[PDB]
């Protein structure tokens, strides 16, 4: 009431693209507990890595690392089907417990992180200033990662829809889709947002019949 305890920086986890995703927002009063459900990046993923992050930078690699831990024993499924409920719990002692739970498999992995862990009074302000300085480069990095994932989704989605469509797909259409995907996958290996969007434009146009089918 004369004071508060507040997280001076956001806490969260690395998500595909190497982007920090916040669970506890900066200047939050402890005790506190936020949860969020994530999934797998790739088919038949047996495990997820949980890399824990302090800071306000959109790149995970510009934030302070607090720890990382695996959750294995993910029973095989498609991408983005498993439910991995991640919880940030800071108790009244300034201690953070991060848990990851496979909501099907019942499995659970925690890490506890000392109140004293992370960046001290000085490094904090340096991080906060840095966030405002490189706020541009970060908005850009973010929409590049959002674009990569869209492209990535649209790649995986399309390949699946080529198999379920099987013979229904006119040879021509396949050839054309086949190669637009190969171009996409290459450009996804790049850093060039425009180029990823271009192979995404290319696929939209050549897939128009593959979609007609998939609707069935």
């Amino acid at each position: 009431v004369l004071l508060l305890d507040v997280t001076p920086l956001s806490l969260g986890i690395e998500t595909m693209g190497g982007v920090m995703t916040t669970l506890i927002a900066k200047n939050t009063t402890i005790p506190t507990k936020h949860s969020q459900v994530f999934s797998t990046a790739e088919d038949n993923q047996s495990a997820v890595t949980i890399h824990v992050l302090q800071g306000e930078r959109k790149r995970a690699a510009d934030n302070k690392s607090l720890g990382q831990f695996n959750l294995d024993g993910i029973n095989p499924a498609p991408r983005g089907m498993p439910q991995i409920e991640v919880t940030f719990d800071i108790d009244a002692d300034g201690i953070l417990h991060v848990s990851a739970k496979d909501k099907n498999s019942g499995k659970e992995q925690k890490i506890t992180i000392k109140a004293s862990s992370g960046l001290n009074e000085d490094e904090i302000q340096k991080m906060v200033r840095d966030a405002e300085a490189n706020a541009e480069a970060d908005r850009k990095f973010e929409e590049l990662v959002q674009t990569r994932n869209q492209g990535d989704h649209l790649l995986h989605s399309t390949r699946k829809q080529v198999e379920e469509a099987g013979d229904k797909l006119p040879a021509d259409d396949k050839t054309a889709i086949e190669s637009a995907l190969t171009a996409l996958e290459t450009a996804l290996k790049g850093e060039d947002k425009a180029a990823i969007e271009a192979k995404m434009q290319e696929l939209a146009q050549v897939s128009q019949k593959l979609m007609e089918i998939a609707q069935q």
Binding site: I13, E14, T15, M16, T21, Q36, V37, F38, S39, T40, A41, E42, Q45, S46, A47, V48, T49, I50, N70, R79, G80, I84, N149
Partner: peptide, 6 residues
């Protein structure tokens, strides 16, 4: 959702 790698 949002995803992670192993």
């Amino acid at each position: 959702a949002l995803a992670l790698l192993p």
